[PDB]
Scaffold this active site. Structure first.
Site, PDB file in Angstrom:
ATOM      1  N   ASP A  41      40.628  42.978  40.925  1.00  0.00           N
ATOM      2  CA  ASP A  41      39.344  42.711  41.578  1.00  0.00           C
ATOM      3  C   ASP A  41      39.407  41.484  42.483  1.00  0.00           C
ATOM      4  OD1 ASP A  41      38.095  44.916  40.512  1.00  0.00           O
ATOM      5  OD2 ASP A  41      36.608  43.792  39.351  1.00  0.00           O
ATOM      6  N   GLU A  66      31.500  39.791  44.232  1.00  0.00           N
ATOM      7  CA  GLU A  66      31.262  39.979  42.800  1.00  0.00           C
ATOM      8  C   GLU A  66      32.089  39.036  41.935  1.00  0.00           C
ATOM      9  OE1 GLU A  66      32.537  43.793  40.719  1.00  0.00           O
ATOM     10  OE2 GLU A  66      30.365  43.952  40.429  1.00  0.00           O
ATOM     11  N   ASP A 140      32.097  44.007  47.215  1.00  0.00           N
ATOM     12  CA  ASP A 140      32.402  44.535  45.893  1.00  0.00           C
ATOM     13  C   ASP A 140      33.776  45.199  45.978  1.00  0.00           C
ATOM     14  OD1 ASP A 140      32.230  45.269  43.207  1.00  0.00           O
ATOM     15  OD2 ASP A 140      30.214  46.094  43.400  1.00  0.00           O
ATOM     16  N   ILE A 142      36.277  46.548  43.894  1.00  0.00           N
ATOM     17  CA  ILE A 142      36.375  47.891  43.331  1.00  0.00           C
ATOM     18  C   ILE A 142      35.138  48.130  42.465  1.00  0.00           C
ATOM     19  CG2 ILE A 142      37.779  49.528  42.014  1.00  0.00           C
ATOM     20  CD1 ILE A 142      40.122  47.402  42.357  1.00  0.00           C
ATOM     21  N   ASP A 143      34.252  49.014  42.917  1.00  0.00           N
ATOM     22  CA  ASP A 143      33.052  49.347  42.153  1.00  0.00           C
ATOM     23  C   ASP A 143      33.305  50.542  41.238  1.00  0.00           C
ATOM     24  OD1 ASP A 143      30.286  48.805  41.469  1.00  0.00           O
ATOM     25  OD2 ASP A 143      29.730  50.570  42.633  1.00  0.00           O
ATOM     26  N   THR A 145      34.101  50.063  37.732  1.00  0.00           N
ATOM     27  CA  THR A 145      35.262  49.558  36.992  1.00  0.00           C
ATOM     28  C   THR A 145      35.697  50.465  35.834  1.00  0.00           C
ATOM     29  OG1 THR A 145      35.134  47.193  37.585  1.00  0.00           O
ATOM     30  CG2 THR A 145      35.934  47.699  35.359  1.00  0.00           C
ATOM     31  N   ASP A 270      26.447  45.203  45.207  1.00  0.00           N
ATOM     32  CA  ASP A 270      26.351  46.601  44.787  1.00  0.00           C
ATOM     33  C   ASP A 270      25.588  47.470  45.786  1.00  0.00           C
ATOM     34  OD1 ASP A 270      27.720  46.923  42.212  1.00  0.00           O
ATOM     35  OD2 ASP A 270      26.236  45.512  41.427  1.00  0.00           O
TER      36      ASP A 270
HETATM   37 GD   LIG Z   1      34.663  42.691  38.694  1.00  0.00          GD
HETATM   38 GD   LIG Z   2      29.659  46.577  40.933  1.00  0.00          GD
END
Ligand SMILES: [Gd]
Ligand SMILES: [Gd]
Length: 327
Positions: A41, A66, A140, A142-143, A145, A270
């Site tokens: 991340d 994030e 963000d 990598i959304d 997770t 997000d």
């Molecule tokens: Gd994260």
């Molecule tokens: Gd996220």
């Protein structure tokens, strides 16, 4: 800001490369102790931060996200995540975090420093200038997770919309106006769209949208009410779908007409990326708790960075009014 946006597409593909590498390479796939997901991340977000500063000096300090730029390894040592400039120096940094795992460290550094030349020909035609002094960026890396780690490559989509799987993973980059708080540009990158069963190679897809001073442009959309809610959703044709960025992309693609989230567990990073693309198509995102009592989401002021009172993502304000009537 077309010249910036064109650059943000490259880094999203560079980010998607990192995502695709951390699941298709043998050593990276095997990976309070070692937390590879946060490592992946932070690394993605740092790549974005440095590449943009490199191309547009001054943008580095305006990039927010994030994750932090700092990590704590197994020894307890706190490491500031700064890559390069040379590929050799990045190996030294990563091996500190990875306890000395040189095979994994060099595997990442090759992908991180790998050149990528992604360019939409349609965007080269466009010439828009936005003052660099009014731009802020929410990232963000990598959304979704949980979906990324499980890594389900076999899920069947329920009427176009995947309930789960690697398709729900998105790289989300969103640009906004500092003074007003309105999102201006947005990049959504699915690193996992279509896999070849025989070669195991994943192919991705990049989505963009710009909305500046009344000028609205977005990427070409593939052809083909519908409500999409999350897996944890508990508030009263509806579809379950994983991923904050994904469900927003479902409203963008037209697969769903409404994306509603009731809880206060989504943040600016997000939604910023998706909001801007929706905005360029004449849509947006409204505070759910406010509508139950049309106010858009801002990205410049805090509360801290959580969208308190939930959200309703819409592609058409007419469709929104139809949904607001029923509920
Ligand atoms: Gd994260
Ligand atoms: Gd996220």
């Amino acid at each position: 800001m077309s010249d910036i946006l064109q650059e943000l597409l490259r880094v999203s593909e560079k980010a998607a490369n990192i995502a695709r590498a951390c699941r298709q390479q043998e050593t990276l796939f095997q990976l309070f102790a070692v937390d590879f997901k946060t490592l992946a991340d932070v690394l993605v977000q740092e790549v974005i931060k440095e590449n943009m500063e490199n191309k547009f000096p001054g943008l580095g300090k305006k990039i927010f996200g994030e994750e932090s730029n700092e990590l704590t390894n197994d020894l307890g040592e706190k490491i500031i995540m700064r890559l390069g400039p040379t590929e050799e120096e990045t190996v030294a940094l990563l091996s500190k975090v990875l306890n000395g795992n040189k095979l994994a460290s060099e595997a990442l550094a090759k992908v991180v420093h790998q050149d990528v030349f992604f360019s939409d020909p349609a965007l080269d035609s466009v010439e828009i200038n936005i003052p660099q002094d009014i731009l802020g960026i929410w990232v963000d890396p990598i959304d979704s997770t949980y979906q990324y780690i499980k890594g389900s490559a076999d899920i069947t989509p329920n009427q176009g919309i995947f309930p789960s799987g690697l398709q729900c993973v998105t790289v989300l980059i969103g640009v906004y106006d500092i003074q007003t708080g309105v999102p201006l540009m947005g990049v959504i990158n699915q690193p996992f769209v279509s896999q070849d069963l025989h070669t195991r190679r994943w192919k991705g897809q990049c989505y963009w949208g710009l909305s500046y001073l009344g000028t609205n442009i977005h990427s070409l959309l593939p052809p083909v009410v519908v409500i999409s809610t999350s897996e944890k959703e508990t508030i009263k044709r509806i579809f379950r779908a994983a991923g904050a960025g994904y469900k927003s992309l479902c409203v963008i693609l037209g697969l769903a007409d409404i994306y509603i989230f009731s809880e206060d567990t989504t943040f600016k990073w997000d939604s910023c990326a998706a909001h801007a693309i929706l905005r360029a198509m004449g849509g947006g995102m409204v505070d759910l708790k406010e509508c139950l009592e049309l106010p858009q989401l801002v990205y410049h002021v805090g509360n801290q960075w959580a969208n308190k009172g939930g959200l309703i993502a819409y592609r058409s304000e007419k469709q929104l009014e139809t949904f607001l009537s029923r509920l």
